[PDB]
Design a protein around this ligand. Structure first.
Ligand SMILES: OC[C@H]1O[C@@H](O[C@H]2[C@H](O)[C@H](O)[C@H](O[C@H]3[C@H](O)[C@H](O)[C@H](O[C@H]4[C@H](O)[C@H](O)[C@H](O[C@H]5[C@H](O)[C@H](O)[C@H](O)O[C@@H]5CO)O[C@@H]4CO)O[C@@H]3CO)O[C@@H]2CO)[C@@H](O)[C@@H](O)[C@@H]1O
Ligand SMILES: [Ca+2]
Length: 171
């Protein structure tokens, strides 16, 4: 099948951040501010301030945005960056959800142990980089994309960044 890019969010400007909201948590917490713009990471990225205790297999924080063409789309991609602090252990289990309908997509398709990760550099600082690619079916009536950042025995108190959110549809 062939696809074109329908929507893309690169967070080049802080005014994009108002389109995103905190859609909840599960066995994890947001700090304050929960979500903010960061202009160094990714030349602009969405910064989630999180606290994951690292005691269970599913410790989730979630952000969301409306996308008018979401019901026409079939592939989602995004990047997650985590500061390359020494000693971090555990697994990320990132996924996403389409709503209305709370349609969970990509469950356990992009899981990554943090210990053996690609790195990327911004501003002379290193970040662990995790790419997420999810295929799904055209889903009628959906209008919101929720991105779920999930830790699995990943004890971490600090920022996690999202960037390069891309949605593709068929030509
Ligand atoms: O407010 C918005 C929205 O929230 C809804 O509630 C959400 C809630 O906030 C959470 O996001 C919750 O999250 C669940 C995930 O969707 C998913 O179901 C996840 O499933 C995991 C599971 O926990 C477990 O880790 C499992 O591990 C397995 C593994 O699959 C394999 O079988 C292996 O062999 O065994 C292990 C161990 O058993 O893997 C699953 C993923 O594949 O569980 C999360 C915790 O429950 O989802 C809720 C919705 O279901 C609602 O309040 C809604 O009303 C509201 O709109
Ligand atoms: Ca960016």
């Amino acid at each position: 099948a062939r696809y074109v890019l329908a929507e893309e969010v690169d967070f080049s400007s802080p005014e994009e951040v108002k389109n995103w909201w905190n859609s909840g948590t599960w066995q994890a917490e947001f700090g304050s501010p929960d979500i903010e713009w960061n202009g160094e990471v990714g030349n602009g990225a969405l910064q989630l301030n999180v606290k994951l205790p690292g005691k269970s297999d599913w410790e989730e924080v979630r952000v969301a945005r409306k996308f008018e063409r979401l019901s026409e789309c079939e592939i989602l991609e995004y990047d997650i960056y985590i500061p390359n602090v020494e000693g971090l252990k555990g697994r990320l289990r990132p996924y996403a959800v389409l709503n209305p309908g709370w349609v969970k997509i990509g469950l356990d398709m992009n899981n990554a142990n943090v210990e053996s990760a690609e790195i990327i550099t911004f501003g002379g600082k290193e970040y662990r980089r995790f790419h997420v690619r999810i295929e799904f079916d055209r889903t009628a009536g959906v209008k919101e994309l929720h991105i779920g950042v999930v830790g699995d025995h990943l004890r971490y108190d600090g920022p996690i960044f999202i960037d390069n959110v891309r949605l593709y549809k068929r030509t």
